């Protein structure tokens, strides 16, 4: 009655049909580390982070959207899944400017995060490492765009939520800028929301810019006013 | 190459552009051609329209071509930002591609490159201060069998030297054009032997065949 | 067995390789077109696939999947959503003309293949997706599609018989990734081309939502003369697994280059200089020898000079047998400077979707750049060989792994001239 | 007054107990005697989502952009 | 047959295709719908 | 210093041009490594006598 | 390498070298740096308040 067998790392999980395997081994407690899916949108795969060695494959295969066959055993702690990210953790730090003091996401990064606890340390990659001028999208929201690592969450984010349908990919290869073409200050609703999406700091809040670097800041709950709703 | 628009004017929307009924039928035509329901299928070739009809697609053309096709820009811009047939900037009459990659640039383009470079003028990768001859090298084509190639205005030469360089453009300043087709003699991609072809006249139907 | 095959005439699949007779449906039916091709649709799919499973066609385009299993995954039953048939008809792989030649000289075998792939799956129409280059080829497939139709024949209720089968040509807009898989799928949806993921097979979802298939226009060619032929026949010329003709050409560095069909294994000698004049200044006078194109390894004198021509053979020799290039190339110009250009047209054509083909791409460009003038260090001749080993197969496309095998062939042959390149920039600077 | 900082007459301040379960919490803040206020945990929502949905045919989910 | 019997090509103006496209519109059978007439209506 | 950077700070030629580096150094200084959960006791030869830490 | 003074750098010819990158408050175990940081009406993010301690400084 509707139900699939996998097993992660021999323990054994029931899976409903047609979902991923990341649900699934979320599911059992392993967050496997992810950059380009995020729940509340569909589902791209343009940042391959989330390779995973599923067994009798010399291929391993993405788990943000893989259909979820019978009987699987899927090797997360393995070699080669450990060597696919540390090489594509090594990829995306050579593009990427040193920018961690006046990054405004010291504490919240996710490249930082993430490259600590999954990457290499000696760096390649020697010359190089091209750069993509800002742009200027609204005056309530602060834009770096050489951190832009292109990973298309914003763009679903607009074109799957706000609906504007205000940001694309432009170019090809190593150049792909991502807005708004035609020096529109984009100003929608929930642009806001936007600096909550962008997971590397490259989109950040305007007028909080430079106050803090959330070590200090003290975390509380509370209850929304201004709307309804909270 | 400067891929944010940045208006500069003889752009700037309003830039006036419209087509002609008999192109609005051609519209017609090419988006009744894909199913209902999937509209948006059909950008790329009213793109080409406007480009074959105006030279260059300023935003305007872009614009008109989003509220024809009742998209947001934003797919056209992707798409116009996107490929290599659609040129941005404005060119000349003439535009020239100088292919030149793999079997092409070891058959000698440096010395079409250079052939080119100083009959014309103008640098690699720029424009002239005239039109017909906005010149860019481009990777590979396709029609690679030959000399390193040439595609003008929906044409291609091949089999080139550069007396025949000065001699096509000296009628493209004249006005006159020769073929698209190969050079040398040798009427096709052919085997430049003796016909190492077929050579009888081919049966076809007539002969041995099974269940028909 | 043959003693390694080679070109038995008559048993040309397609004639006509330029300028024959006329250009003309009349002179297709002359040719073998428009023949007792009703009854052959009229006895069910299923006998059509037996008739290519029984022929066993390699899938042409440099890839290996057999058209036999993809046409079979085909046969779903068809519900409310239709079927739709796209031919592919971009030419990468730089150096190629495969269908260039096909589609200037001859469409109506196409016309017919067509149709006959959209009586064999249930497709009802077929979108044929010609590159942006062929602005006058695409004109004259035009021409034949106005006399297919003007024959009355195709379109609607095709062969007389209630069934019809409508066929659109899209250009293309210059790319080398519109020619795979599935950027071709939403190259046509107008969106901008580039890949989908692929366990969604398109054969489930594909154009908007529709059990599509992609054919490549040699399988088109080849299709209806195997349907009007006998079972077999085409299996008769080479091996088991791979079977049949195959247009290998050089286009590149011999004298007289040209473009030739022939069965399936070729001694590579005879193959060189017994067809297409000579090579440029002799047998002994290349450096390497490249078959496939440009997403193939090399493949060095002393390999070149023994290694017949088999998808197999060259299976046996780690790499991967395409189209239409099986060039040599000269000792006179350097490999490290003809491979560093393919590496800077893979940098200039590539979608930006998957990070590691980018930035692989982007390393190995300027490392390239960085070897051509030669100011690096061993470690990183190394160090490029271990990045090759990570981009394999990490990506979406085999743009990405066709960047990886160019630099994995040098590596794995030519260190010598790399080793004295840096030596002689060493002595340079000193 | 005299730098700009935030002094505090509460030495209880910067307390914090990270537990295991909330019966052991209640269990503990009780048997320490002062009072408390228990706010529920809230798992993310389990969904159902595929990218052959994102290329809905007649379906509204659709990708839009690439 | 050793003659180009091309040149049928040279002709071809920068209209032609969509000329070709243009006239060659009739016998088009309806291109199913699907509901509503396009993704966002 | 240890070669395993996700422990050891690196130095200020790679600080000053890395990413992975800048990264280790940054994150390394704000937060402090993680250590596997566990108890442990040494003790070596302080010249009082067993310096012991657990 | 005497420790001593806790004196500021700036660049040749140039404003003060510091970001504001609260590193060294993150670090200092007195917690005697107090950094309050601000941008100025150019651009570059800077300060406001840089407070040390010397009763906390352990140096
Ligand atoms: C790297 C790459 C490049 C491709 N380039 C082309 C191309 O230029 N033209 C083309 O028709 N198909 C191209 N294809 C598609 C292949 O030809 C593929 O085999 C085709 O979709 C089906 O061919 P088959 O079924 O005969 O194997 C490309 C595919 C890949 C992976
Ligand atoms: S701006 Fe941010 S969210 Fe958008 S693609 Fe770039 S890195 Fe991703
Ligand atoms: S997003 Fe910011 S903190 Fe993260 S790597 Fe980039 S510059 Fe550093
Ligand atoms: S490997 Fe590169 S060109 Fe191929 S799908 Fe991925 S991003 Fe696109
Ligand atoms: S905030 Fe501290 S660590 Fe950062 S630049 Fe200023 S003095 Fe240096
Ligand atoms: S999470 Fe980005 S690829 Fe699956
Ligand atoms: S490389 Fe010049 S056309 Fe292919």
């Known amino acids: 009655s509707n139900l699939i067998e996998v097993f992660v790392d021999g323990q054994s999980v029931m899976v409903e049909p047609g979902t991923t395997v990341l649900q699934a081994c979320e599911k059992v407690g392993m967050q496997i580390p992810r950059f380009c899916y995020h729940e509340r949108l569909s589902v791209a795969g343009n940042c391959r982070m989330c390779l995973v060695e599923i067994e009798k494959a010399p291929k391993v295969v993405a788990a943000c959207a893989m259909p979820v066959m019978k009987g699987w055993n899927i090797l997360t702690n393995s070699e080669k899944t450990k060597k696919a990210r540390e090489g594509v953790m090594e990829f995306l730090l050579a593009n990427h400017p040193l920018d961690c003091p006046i990054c405004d996401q010291g504490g919240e990064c996710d490249l930082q995060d993430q490259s600590m606890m999954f990457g290499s340390d000696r760096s390649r990659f020697l010359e190089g490492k091209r750069a993509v001028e800002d742009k200027n999208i609204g005056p309530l929201v602060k834009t770096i765009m050489?951190?832009?690592?292109?990973?298309?969450?914003?763009?679903?984010?607009?074109?799957?939520?706000?609906?504007?349908?205000?940001?694309?990919?432009?170019?090809?290869?190593?150049?792909?800028?991502?807005?708004?073409?035609?020096?529109?200050?984009?100003?929608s609703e929930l642009s806001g929301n936007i600096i909550d999406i962008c997971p590397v700091g490259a989109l950040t809040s305007k007028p909080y810019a430079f106050t803090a670097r959330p070590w200090e800041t003290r975390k509380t709950e509370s209850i929304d006013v201004m709307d309804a709703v909270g | 190459a400067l891929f944010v628009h940045r208006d500069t004017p003889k752009n700037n929307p309003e830039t006036p552009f419209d087509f002609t009924p008999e192109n609005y039928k051609r519209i017609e035509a090419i988006v009744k051609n894909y199913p209902e329901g999937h509209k948006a299928a059909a950008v790329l070739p009213v793109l080409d329209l406007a480009q074959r009809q105006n030279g260059w697609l300023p935003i305007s053309a872009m614009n008109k071509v989003a509220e024809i096709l009742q998209v947001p820009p934003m797919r056209v811009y992707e798409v116009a930002t996107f490929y290599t047939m659609y040129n941005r900037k404005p060119v000349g009459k003439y535009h020239i591609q100088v292919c030149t990659t793999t079997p092409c640039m070891l058959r000698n383009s440096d010395s079409?490159?250079?052939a080119i470079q100083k009959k014309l003028g103008?640098?690699?990768?720029?424009?002239?201060?005239?039109?017909?001859?906005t010149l860019i090298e481009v990777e590979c084509l396709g029609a690679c069998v030959n000399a390193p190639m040439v595609q003008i205005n929906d044409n291609y030469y091949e089999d080139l030297t550069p007396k025949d360089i000065e001699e096509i453009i000296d009628e493209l300043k004249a006005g006159k054009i020769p073929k698209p087709g190969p050079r040398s003699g040798r009427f096709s991609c052919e085997p430049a032997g003796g016909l190492t072809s077929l050579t009888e006249p081919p049966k076809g139907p007539g002969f041995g065949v099974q269940a028909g | 067995k043959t003693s390694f095959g080679s070109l038995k005439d008559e048993d040309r699949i397609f004639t006509n390789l330029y300028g024959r007779h006329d250009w003309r449906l009349k002179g297709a039916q002359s040719r073998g077109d428009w023949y007792k091709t009703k009854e052959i649709l009229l006895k069910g799919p299923d006998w059509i696939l037996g008739e290519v499973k029984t022929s066993g066609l390699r899938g042409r385009g440099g890839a290996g999947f057999p058209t036999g299993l993809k046409w079979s995954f085909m046969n779903k039953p068809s519900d409310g959503r239709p079927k739709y048939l796209v031919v592919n008809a971009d030419e990468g792989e730089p150096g190629t003309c495969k269908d260039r030649e096909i589609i200037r000289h001859d469409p109506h075998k196409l016309v017919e293949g067509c149709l006959v792939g959209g009586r064999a799956m249930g497709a009802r129409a077929a979108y044929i997706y010609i590159r942006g280059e062929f602005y006058n080829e695409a004109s004259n497939l035009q021409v034949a599609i106005r006399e297919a139709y003007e024959a009355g024949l195709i379109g609607k209720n095709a062969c007389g018989s209630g069934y019809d089968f409508d066929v659109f040509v899209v250009r293309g807009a210059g790319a080398y990734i519109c020619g795979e898989e599935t950027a071709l799928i939403e190259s046509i949806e107008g969106k901008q081309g580039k890949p989908r993921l692929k366990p969604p097979f398109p054969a489930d979802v594909g154009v908007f939502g529709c059990p599509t298939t992609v054919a490549n226009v040699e399988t088109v060619a080849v299709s209806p003369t195997i349907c009007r032929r006998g079972g077999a026949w085409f299996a008769s010329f080479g091996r088991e697994r791979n079977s049949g003709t195959k247009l290998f050409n050089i286009s590149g560095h011999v004298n007289n280059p040209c473009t030739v069909e022939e069965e399936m294994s070729v001694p590579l000698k005879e193959l060189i200089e017994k067809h297409a004049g000579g090579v440029?200044?002799?047998?002994?006078?290349?450096?390497?020898?490249?078959?496939?194109?440009?997403?193939?390894?090399?493949?060095?004198?002393?390999?070149?000079?023994?290694?017949?021509?088999?998808?197999?053979?060259?299976?046996?020799?780690?790499?991967?047998?395409?189209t239409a290039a099986v060039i040599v190339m000269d000792r006179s110009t350097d490999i490290v400077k003809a491979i560093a250009r393919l590496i800077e047209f893979y940098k200039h054509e590539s979608c930006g979707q998957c990070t590691p083909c980018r930035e692989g791409v982007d390393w190995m460009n300027k490392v390239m750049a960085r070897f051509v003038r030669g100011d690096a260090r061993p470690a990183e001749i190394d160090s490029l060989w271990e990045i090759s080993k990570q981009i394999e197969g990490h990506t979406i496309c085999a743009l990405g792994d066709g960047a990886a095998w160019p630099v994995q062939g040098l590596i794995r042959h030519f260190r010598p001239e790399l080793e004295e390149r840096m030596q002689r920039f060493a002595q340079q600077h000193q | 007054p005299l730098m700009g900082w935030a002094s505090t007459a509460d030495p209880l301040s910067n307390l914090v107990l990270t537990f295991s379960t909330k019966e052991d919490?209640?269990?503990?803040?009780?048997?320490?005697?002062?009072?408390?206020?228990?706010?529920?945990?809230?798992?993310?929502?389990?969904?159902?989502?595929?990218?052959?949905?994102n290329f809905s045919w007649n379906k509204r989910t659709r990708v839009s952009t690439k | 047959n050793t003659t180009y019997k091309n040149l049928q090509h040279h002709d071809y103006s920068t209209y032609t295709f969509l000329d070709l496209n243009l006239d060659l519109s009739k016998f088009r059978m309806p291109q199913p719908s699907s509901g509503r007439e396009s993704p966002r209506h | 210093k240890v070669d395993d950077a996700k422990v050891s700070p690196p130095k200020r030629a790679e600080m000053k041009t890395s990413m992975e580096s800048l990264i280790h150094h940054f994150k390394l200084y704000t937060e402090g490594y993680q250590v596997p959960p566990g108890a442990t006791y040494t003790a070596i030869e302080a010249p009082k006598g067993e310096f012991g830490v657990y | 390498r005497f420790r001593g003074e806790h004196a500021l750098?700036?660049?040749?010819?140039?404003?003060?070298?510091?970001?504001?990158?609260?590193?060294?408050?993150?670090?200092?175990?007195?917690?005697?740096?107090?950094?309050?940081?601000?941008?100025?009406a150019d651009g570059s993010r800077r300060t406001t308040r840089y407070d040390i301690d010397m009763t906390k400084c352990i140096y």
């Open chain 1, 146 to 187: 050489t951190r832009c690592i292109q990973c298309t969450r914003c763009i679903r984010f607009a074109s799957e939520i706000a609906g504007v349908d205000d940001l694309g990919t432009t170019g090809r290869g190593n150049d792909m800028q991502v807005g708004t073409y035609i020096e529109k200050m984009f100003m």
């Open chain 2, 112 to 114: 079409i490159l250079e």
């Open chain 2, 122 to 133: 103008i640098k690699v990768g720029e424009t002239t201060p005239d039109k017909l001859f």
């Open chain 3, 280 to 322: 440029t200044g002799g047998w002994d006078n290349l450096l390497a020898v490249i078959p496939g194109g440009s997403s193939t390894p090399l493949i060095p004198k002393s390999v070149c000079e023994t290694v017949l021509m088999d998808f197999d053979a060259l299976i046996q020799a780690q790499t991967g047998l395409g």
């Open chain 4, 25 to 53: 919490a209640i269990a503990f803040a009780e048997k320490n005697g002062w009072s408390y206020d228990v706010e529920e945990r809230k798992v993310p929502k389990p969904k159902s989502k595929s990218y052959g949905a």
């Open chain 7, 9 to 40: 750098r700036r660049y040749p010819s140039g404003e003060e070298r510091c970001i504001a990158c609260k590193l060294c408050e993150a670090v200092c175990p007195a917690q005697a740096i107090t950094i309050e940081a601000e941008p100025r």
